[PDB]
Design a protein around this motif. Structure first.
Motif, short mmCIF file in Angstrom:
data_model
loop_
_atom_site.label_atom_id
_atom_site.label_comp_id
_atom_site.label_asym_id
_atom_site.label_seq_id
_atom_site.Cartn_x
_atom_site.Cartn_y
_atom_site.Cartn_z
N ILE A 31 16.32 47.37 30.06
CA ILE A 31 14.85 47.70 31.01
C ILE A 31 13.95 47.48 30.55
O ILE A 31 13.25 46.86 31.10
N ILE A 32 14.35 48.98 30.08
CA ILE A 32 12.63 48.78 29.42
C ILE A 32 12.05 47.77 28.58
O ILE A 32 10.65 47.02 28.82
N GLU A 33 12.77 47.54 27.39
CA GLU A 33 12.29 46.43 26.59
C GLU A 33 11.89 44.87 27.46
O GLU A 33 11.18 44.49 27.19
N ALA A 34 12.98 44.52 28.54
CA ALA A 34 12.97 43.75 29.34
C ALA A 34 11.82 43.64 30.68
O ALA A 34 10.42 42.66 30.05
N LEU A 35 11.06 44.44 31.02
CA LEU A 35 10.56 44.78 31.74
C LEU A 35 8.90 44.30 30.29
O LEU A 35 7.97 44.40 30.70
N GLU A 36 8.33 45.38 29.48
CA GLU A 36 7.85 45.70 28.64
C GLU A 36 7.54 43.78 28.27
O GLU A 36 6.19 43.49 28.22
N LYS A 37 8.33 43.08 27.83
CA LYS A 37 8.59 41.54 27.35
C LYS A 37 8.10 41.24 28.85
O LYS A 37 7.72 40.15 28.57
N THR A 38 8.29 40.88 30.17
CA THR A 38 8.16 40.62 31.00
C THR A 38 6.55 40.90 32.03
O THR A 38 6.55 40.18 32.75
N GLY A 39 6.34 41.90 30.92
CA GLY A 39 4.20 42.37 31.26
C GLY A 39 4.99 42.85 32.29
O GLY A 39 4.14 43.32 33.91
N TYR A 40 5.48 44.39 32.11
CA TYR A 40 6.17 44.58 33.88
C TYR A 40 6.49 44.88 34.99
O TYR A 40 5.28 45.19 35.75
N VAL A 41 6.74 44.00 35.24
CA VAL A 41 7.42 43.25 36.32
C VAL A 41 8.80 43.23 36.59
O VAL A 41 9.73 43.14 35.34
N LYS A 42 9.38 43.87 37.43
CA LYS A 42 10.92 43.86 37.85
C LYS A 42 12.00 42.86 38.26
O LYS A 42 12.36 42.95 37.46
N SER A 43 10.81 42.35 38.80
CA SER A 43 11.50 40.94 38.82
C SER A 43 12.02 39.96 37.77
O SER A 43 12.73 39.30 37.69
N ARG A 44 11.00 39.79 37.25
CA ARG A 44 11.11 39.34 35.63
C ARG A 44 12.71 40.38 35.22
O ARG A 44 12.77 39.07 34.77
N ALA A 45 11.71 41.32 35.16
CA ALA A 45 12.86 42.27 34.30
C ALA A 45 14.01 41.82 34.49
O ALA A 45 15.29 42.13 33.81
N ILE A 60 15.91 51.92 37.33
CA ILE A 60 14.18 52.70 36.81
C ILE A 60 13.93 54.29 37.68
O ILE A 60 13.56 55.04 36.44
N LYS A 61 14.63 53.87 38.70
CA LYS A 61 14.49 55.45 38.50
C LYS A 61 15.80 56.41 38.77
O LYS A 61 15.12 57.73 37.86
N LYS A 62 17.00 56.24 38.24
CA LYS A 62 18.08 56.95 37.02
C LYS A 62 17.24 56.62 35.70
O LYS A 62 17.42 58.26 35.33
N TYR A 63 16.51 56.22 35.53
CA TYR A 63 16.31 56.19 33.75
C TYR A 63 15.14 56.85 33.99
O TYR A 63 14.07 57.38 32.69
N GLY A 64 13.99 56.87 35.28
CA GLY A 64 12.93 57.10 35.05
C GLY A 64 11.36 56.54 34.51
O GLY A 64 10.77 57.10 33.51
N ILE A 65 12.07 55.29 33.81
CA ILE A 65 11.44 54.52 33.72
C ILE A 65 9.87 53.82 33.93
O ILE A 65 9.63 53.73 35.22
N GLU A 66 8.73 53.74 33.55
CA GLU A 66 7.78 53.05 33.92
C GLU A 66 6.77 52.26 33.98
O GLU A 66 8.06 51.08 33.10
N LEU A 67 6.14 51.40 34.65
CA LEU A 67 5.81 50.13 34.01
C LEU A 67 4.56 49.89 35.40
O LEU A 67 4.17 50.34 36.80
N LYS A 68 3.56 49.48 34.59
CA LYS A 68 2.27 48.79 35.23
C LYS A 68 2.02 47.81 36.11
O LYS A 68 2.49 46.69 35.31
N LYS A 69 2.65 47.98 37.53
CA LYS A 69 2.44 46.55 38.44
C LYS A 69 2.45 47.08 39.88
O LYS A 69 2.03 48.47 39.89
N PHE A 70 0.92 46.25 40.43
CA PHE A 70 0.71 46.20 41.77
C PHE A 70 1.31 45.33 42.89
O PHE A 70 0.78 45.71 44.12
#
Length: 70
Positions: A31-45, A60-70
């Motif tokens: 999850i974190i890998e895809a997000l980072e590779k997608t640019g911190y995007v849930k939709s893309r990830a 994301i909530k279960k693993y408490g992962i972070e992500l930079k997106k507004f």
């Protein structure tokens, strides 16, 4: 025990066996890998990994992962 050897060769590893830690580790890392590779995007990830907004979000909530997106 008269003998006092390390028994390094006699030792047999136990590869077989599934644990939860591995799942949470492989899942969170993915999850974190895809997000980072997608640019911190849930939709893309989500679309990248193969899960829906609901599934991804739940991870994301279960693993408490972070992500930079507004």
């Amino acid at each position: 025990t008269s003998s006092e050897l390390p028994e390094l060769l006699r030792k047999r590893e136990r590869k077989t066996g599934d644990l939860p830690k591995f799942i949470e580790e492989t899942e969170k890392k993915r999850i974190i890998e895809a997000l980072e590779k997608t640019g911190y995007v849930k939709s893309r990830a989500a679309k990248l990994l193969g899960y829906t907004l609901r599934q991804l979000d739940y991870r994301i909530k279960k693993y408490g992962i972070e992500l930079k997106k507004f």
